[PDB]
Design a protein around this ligand. Sequence first.
Ligand SMILES: [Zn+2]
Ligand SMILES: [Zn+2]
Lengths: 141, 141
Amino acid sequence: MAANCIFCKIIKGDIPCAKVAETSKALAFMDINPLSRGHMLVIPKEHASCLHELGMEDAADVGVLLAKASRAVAGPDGSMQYNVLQNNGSLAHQEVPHVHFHIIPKTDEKTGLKIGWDTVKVASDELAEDAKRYSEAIAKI
Amino acid sequence: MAANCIFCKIIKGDIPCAKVAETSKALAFMDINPLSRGHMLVIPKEHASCLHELGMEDAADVGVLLAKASRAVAGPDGSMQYNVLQNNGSLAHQEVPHVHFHIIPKTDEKTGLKIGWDTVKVASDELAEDAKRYSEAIAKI
Ligand SMILES: [Zn+2]
Ligand SMILES: [Zn+2]
């Protein structure tokens, strides 16, 4: 559903939204449901539902816009802390089915992104297996 | 402290780590303290402590490697869900002072990245103010 995709609606002009930046392949704007003041979004213009569906040229342009946006979010003296978050799948907390990078200011212990970081044990043999599968997958793109 | 930066140590070869991919400006490898099985990291070779310190060319290369890595993480049939997370500042849960993108498989409600998503109200006037400041900041990069 690109038809029922609110970011496609913004991109084509069917819903208005103040544009923070625009490049050939990407757009930035403010999140109107922020976790903290200054929370923004960077999206590809292409309707990719997950990051792995995004084109390589689109990936270069989105990476560049993300870095530029982080400088905006870091503030005039660069002291503002922040989290970059991009979700892929509804189990992974993705709501709109279109790639979007959140850049979320962390002003406060009580506001912004709150993360649970509980690690698990993985074996050396399992790490090697995953490293092989991943590198071969990446090598053939 | 690039001297006490474990990712710089990996990058220069002072600590061994199976390399999942390597490009001119970026490296990928497995996280040895994973939140879920297959949790990996994508880092710039440059010692940038936060994303806003990263060069634009390095940003393009890291965006491309991130997209490639997501295809690896999505798996042979692309069904694996995942979160991309990059932290900037110790209040923002950044531990190693070198930019690193986590790509974290979400296999399970009980494993992988766990996120708290409590939004705050922002006014139209505040959104316009932030949009102006951000777009002007981005325009002059
Ligand atoms: Zn869309
Ligand atoms: Zn470093």
